Design a protein around this ligand. Sequence first.
Ligand SMILES: O=c1ccn([C@@H]2O[C@H](COP(=O)(O)OP(=O)(O)O[C@H]3O[C@H](CO)[C@@H](O)[C@H](O)[C@H]3O)[C@@H](O)[C@H]2O)c(=O)[nH]1
Ligand SMILES: O=c1ccn([C@@H]2O[C@H](COP(=O)(O)OP(=O)(O)O[C@H]3O[C@H](CO)[C@@H](O)[C@H](O)[C@H]3O)[C@@H](O)[C@H]2O)c(=O)[nH]1
Ligand SMILES: [Cl-]
Ligand SMILES: [Cl-]
Ligand SMILES: [Cl-]
Ligand SMILES: [Cl-]
Ligand SMILES: [Cl-]
Ligand SMILES: [Cl-]
Ligand SMILES: [Cl-]
Ligand SMILES: [Cl-]
Ligand SMILES: [Cl-]
Ligand SMILES: [Cl-]
Ligand SMILES: [Cl-]
Ligand SMILES: [Cl-]
Ligand SMILES: [Mg+2]
Ligand SMILES: [Mg+2]
Ligand SMILES: [Mg+2]
Ligand SMILES: [Mg+2]
Lengths: 290, 290
Amino acid sequence: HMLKVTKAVFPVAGLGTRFLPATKASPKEMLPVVDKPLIQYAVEEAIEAGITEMIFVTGRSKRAIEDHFDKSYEIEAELEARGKEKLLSLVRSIKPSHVDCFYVRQAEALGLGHAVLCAEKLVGDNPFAVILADDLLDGPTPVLRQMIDVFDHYHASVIGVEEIAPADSKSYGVIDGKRWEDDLFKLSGIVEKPEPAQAPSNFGVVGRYVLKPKIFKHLRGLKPGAGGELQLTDAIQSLLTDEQVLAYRYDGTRFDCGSKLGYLKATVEFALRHPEVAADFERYLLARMS
Amino acid sequence: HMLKVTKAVFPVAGLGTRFLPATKASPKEMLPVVDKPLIQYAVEEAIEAGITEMIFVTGRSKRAIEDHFDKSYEIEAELEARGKEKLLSLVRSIKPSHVDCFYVRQAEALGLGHAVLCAEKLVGDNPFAVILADDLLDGPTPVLRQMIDVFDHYHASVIGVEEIAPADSKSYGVIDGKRWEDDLFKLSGIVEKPEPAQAPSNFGVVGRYVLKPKIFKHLRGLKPGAGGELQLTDAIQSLLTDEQVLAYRYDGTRFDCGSKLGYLKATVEFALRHPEVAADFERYLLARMS
Ligand SMILES: O=c1ccn([C@@H]2O[C@H](COP(=O)(O)OP(=O)(O)O[C@H]3O[C@H](CO)[C@@H](O)[C@H](O)[C@H]3O)[C@@H](O)[C@H]2O)c(=O)[nH]1
Ligand SMILES: O=c1ccn([C@@H]2O[C@H](COP(=O)(O)OP(=O)(O)O[C@H]3O[C@H](CO)[C@@H](O)[C@H](O)[C@H]3O)[C@@H](O)[C@H]2O)c(=O)[nH]1
Ligand SMILES: [Cl-]
Ligand SMILES: [Cl-]
Ligand SMILES: [Cl-]
Ligand SMILES: [Cl-]
Ligand SMILES: [Cl-]
Ligand SMILES: [Cl-]
Ligand SMILES: [Cl-]
Ligand SMILES: [Cl-]
Ligand SMILES: [Cl-]
Ligand SMILES: [Cl-]
Ligand SMILES: [Cl-]
Ligand SMILES: [Cl-]
Ligand SMILES: [Mg+2]
Ligand SMILES: [Mg+2]
Ligand SMILES: [Mg+2]
Ligand SMILES: [Mg+2]
């Protein structure tokens, strides 16, 4: 009976400088897409993939994350005294009954690899998901669900990837491997933010991972890599030196809300999806562009 | 030597239900327009109008407001250790040196009039500004500056107004008065959220006021009005029964970020104004609409 994936680690401890001043007292993963934080979309994707344990690695402004998911006595009493039963149900669904939220600190912002390592003793000897909420994903089925299906079948760590334009390679981890299926690669290498001429493929890492606990030994051995940060990507490279690691070309779509441009695109996309504002927003865009 | 206006009251203590779940642990006035909270635009408008004292009336989630404007030791040390001097200057400008931030609680969300009354003993016997940050304003000169100029000249309370469509009158306070100038009215009445057929004019109140301290006596005498809330609008009505109150048609433009639609419009407008993303965002909109 092989181990199942029931834990997800959400690093939300970066500096968020691209979104200052708004990220002064709240992480970039709390930025709202019209009315819902990025991190809530990510947790909802984990929940639909069968994850019941959410581990948040917090840095500066841990309270914005904690108070979003933890029960608020005040808000429930206020909504109940006003008979706003639909809104009350909406607020309670932020953390459904069987979902646990656990918190650990990254005191120093030393990079994504270091953030994941802070969660080591909460994950224990278990496979686990890593979800970067600034990668806002959708798909016919949740991307993490697709990836856990690959993990259960091949019993290897799985890295989510998409095709990128070569000029953007300095924004991504970039994989090097052998094709097994139309959507599946066996990795022989992975590099963080290569120059376009040094990129080994057109396949960039998106912020979804299903990792075997062996990754933690390889995170512990990291030295500073790109940008002086301890890179998860270099631990994956070290890991594939010792055991099999796969990359999965997921079925779906991505907004890079780690950049203002992508955040703007996500906002526009959300708007057209909601009938409360869709028609009116359509009309405004047409008159506004002309 | 008539009293000058140096204090501004920012009510940020509403429930913010239109933006749940994002407003679970942060008020709607903290919602970012791409990278800057609504309340920071409002405080910057006050600063440019000569206001040096910011009074925040907080409700639920007071810490999101407080930690945005109060000095953060952590973030300044982190930006300095990384030599991000421009970002450090950006963060420090959130609260320039001569600007004070004071906090008072509205324990119960009983309406805008009640929120303003909570600030009574911080304002004291002084004229003061009230600024609703969900009204995101711009203009050739700051709207509050235009209004303080009218206050200094006529020595009367001044209410900011714009022309509204008659169907929207249930979203606004609506004035009734006599024209003095192309942009100036002497009020004979004001009503909160009338039915369109009962609206006395096409001029709706926007969230900018310059008020004489006599307003506080009239706020104290309020009874529950529209929506069961203690309405600032009804105190203004009571006040104009006793002394002169003017309404000023400001020179500028408005996004009603108290609604998702207006918030969406503000985001689009901000995007086109920033050369970092403007051209790319243009192209995306055209390909996205087609
Ligand atoms: O010291 C730090 C730095 C970052 N983070 C978190 O780490 C994640 C990634 O940070 P970010 O600056 O957005 O990383 P990227 O530059 O976007 O790159 C990462 O994410 C890409 C996909 O989005 C991958 O292609 C890269 O390989 C991977 O390094 C986020 O959840 C941050 O909150 C921390 O918790 N602590
Ligand atoms: O109990 C409460 C209720 C509201 N607020 C604050 O009061 C302000 C106004 O609240 P909102 O629900 O947005 O009021 P509106 O329905 O938009 O109406 C107000 O703002 C309009 C302009 O935006 C005017 O036309 C109206 O006369 C005036 O009542 C905001 O700053 C809220 O944060 C509180 O602090 N406490
Ligand atoms: Cl970050
Ligand atoms: Cl395993
Ligand atoms: Cl390219
Ligand atoms: Cl293992
Ligand atoms: Cl994108
Ligand atoms: Cl950016
Ligand atoms: Cl509100
Ligand atoms: Cl006065
Ligand atoms: Cl109309
Ligand atoms: Cl007075
Ligand atoms: Cl608007
Ligand atoms: Cl709305
Ligand atoms: Mg980073
Ligand atoms: Mg990122
Ligand atoms: Mg209200
Ligand atoms: Mg409003």
